[PDB]
Amino acid sequence: GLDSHELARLHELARHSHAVITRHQDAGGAYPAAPTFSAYRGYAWLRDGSFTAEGISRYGDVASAGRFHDWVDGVLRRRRGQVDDLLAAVDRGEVPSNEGMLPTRFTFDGNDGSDPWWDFQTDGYGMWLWSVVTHAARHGLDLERWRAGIDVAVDYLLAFWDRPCYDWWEEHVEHRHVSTLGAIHGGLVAVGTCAALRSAPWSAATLQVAARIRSLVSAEGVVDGHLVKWLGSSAVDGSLPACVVPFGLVPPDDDVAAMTRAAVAKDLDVDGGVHRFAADVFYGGGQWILLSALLGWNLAAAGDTAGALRHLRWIADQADADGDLPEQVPHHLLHPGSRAEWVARWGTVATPLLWSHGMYLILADELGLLP
Ligand SMILES: [N+]
């Protein structure tokens, strides 16, 4: 495995990952995406925050992870009326516009940070349900602390899970993305199998809807034995291993899990750095730390320690002078011509990206390498 040279570098990157996350956590509890990146600064995402919260919970900082769940919970309780209004609209056959839906970007005070016409996404609500249930399980906590916010998220997701929306990458609003469906599935199975939530009025409905998601992925989201980026597509996306671990469309040992890991590695992994999708022109289509971390987590869960380690080492080699992990690195670019216009508009690549550090902590934990 690892000599004490490697073990010391990996331990130090874990401790720094904890530090950069808790130091930039907002006073209100939110985890920001990236404190210094022009286009992300001032906002919080449930997707980034939930994976960040899971790394922090595995690290053992119950206080930090708890303030993030408090923040999300309170933000969702404040949307109780908005969600009830959307459901009542649906019940009158007046299907609301993307412009009326719950937001993607939040301000640290829980307001919409963006107009959901331009970035409507449902995955973050499903990831938060997964995150808070897994945190409560790990540390023996009472979910009643966050139940009223869970109720808002469940109600919203049971109504809107099958709606087209933008993918994790804010593209293709017309499509139903398999990693978005996967995130919602993980959240619903998390609350539906949670003994502390056995009397919730939605308990049975969450597992019936999770089964409806798996039926749709079965019918339109599997080609040549692997998951695909969106229903009706042949291609893969770097986010797809999340549909195995942790969101559980299939478990690690399933043939579709194996074929999906192999398709993602062949089509999108270069020397341990995982690309998002073939067409990606964002900063030239670089190699994403969080996606290398996600593939590595999935190889670990499937019993491929070696492959997991190789991805962890690749990630650790992208750490900068201070131990900060960027969003992505340009060692291999899918569309090199496009990088310059992105550096010009938005600046140097987001560094640190909190989600990079969260995913680092998860993969390190899966390999038993936390201090
Ligand atoms: N695991």
Curated annotation (Swiss-Prot):
Regions annotated as coiled coil: none
Keyword Cytoplasm: yes
Localization (cell): Cytoplasm
Entry's pH dependence statement: Optimum pH is 6.7. Stable between pH 6.5 and 11.2.
Catalyzed reactions per annotation: isomaltose + H2O = beta-D-glucose + D-glucose
Function: Involved in the intracellular degradation of the cyclic tetrasaccharide cyclobis-(1-6)-alpha-nigerosyl (CNN) formed extracellularly from starch. Catalyzes the hydrolysis of alpha-1,6-glucosidic linkage from the non-reducing end of isomaltose to yield beta-D-glucose and D-glucose. Can also act on panose and isomaltotriose at a lower rate. It displays low or no activity toward CNN and the general GH15 enzyme substrates such as maltose, soluble starch or dextran.
Protein name as catalogued: Isomaltose glucohydrolase
Organism of this sequence: Kribbella flavida (strain DSM 17836 / JCM 10339 / NBRC 14399)
